[PDB]
Amino acid sequence: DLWQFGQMILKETGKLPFPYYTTYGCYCGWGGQGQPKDATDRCCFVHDCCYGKLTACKPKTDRYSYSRENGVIICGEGTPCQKQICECDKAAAVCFRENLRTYLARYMAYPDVLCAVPEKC
Amino acid sequence: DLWQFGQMILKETGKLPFPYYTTYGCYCGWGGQGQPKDATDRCCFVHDCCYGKLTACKPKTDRYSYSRENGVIICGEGTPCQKQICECDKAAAVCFRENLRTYLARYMAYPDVLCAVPEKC
Numbered sequence: 001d002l003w004q005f006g007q008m009i010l011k012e013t014g015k016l017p018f019p020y021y022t023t024y025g026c027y028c029g030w031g032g033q034g035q036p037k038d039a040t041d042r043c044c045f046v047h048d049c050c051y052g053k054l055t056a057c058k059p060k061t062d063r064y065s066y067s068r069e070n071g072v073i074i075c076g077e078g079t080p081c082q083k084q085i086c087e088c089d090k091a092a093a094v095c096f097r098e099n100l101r102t103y104l105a106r107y108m109a110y111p112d113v114l115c116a117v118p119e120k121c
Numbered sequence: 122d123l124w125q126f127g128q129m130i131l132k133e134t135g136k137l138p139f140p141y142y143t144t145y146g147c148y149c150g151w152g153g154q155g156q157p158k159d160a161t162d163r164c165c166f167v168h169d170c171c172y173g174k175l176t177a178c179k180p181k182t183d184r185y186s187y188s189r190e191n192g193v194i195i196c197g198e199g200t201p202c203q204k205q206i207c208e209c210d211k212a213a214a215v216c217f218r219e220n221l222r223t224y225l226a227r228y229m230a231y232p233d234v235l236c237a238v239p240e241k242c
Contacts, residue, residue: 002230016137016139018123019127030152031151
């Protein structure tokens, strides 16, 4: 569920989801209405697309099991939906971490008048 | 700034902004596009309206001073913008706390297809 996704984000990035990622750029911070501005912004686009493949699941409310082994998120046992939701959240949190060095604070609460139209998955 | 607003939210409600408030309802959780579903949702509407009165300020990046030693947020000294921003943030965090009694978990990640058109401040 979203709480677990937020725990992943904090653990991988060192930042709380609000405001560093929930307000970020033209996709993360504008309800997926704009073209992603950079790699961090695109992580949210991929995460939505990842959830979009789970048509028979409730990615926002289904609680899954996971642990950490050798610094890697290990999605544990559970329903097929639980494992697939976990893999979406893991991929996005690691994506945030991988792009910490191009993260721009001035993209937090970015003025959406300068955002461009968005593309599909 | 936004980091401080999030700290106020945690201190007043005992909940982190994500996901409990950033995904809530039709205004908080839908970028201000829908009409507020309940009192918690309306807190975000009033917060945006409060920021809109501060046309000479930068509510999202300006860092202000405040304390909460005795369970009440006290906005401290600073520029007029810093104090006005602080008061907007305090009022919204208190608004979340005072309406916890009617908070509905089912409004987290509410399906925006059932959100209605919103009003002006």
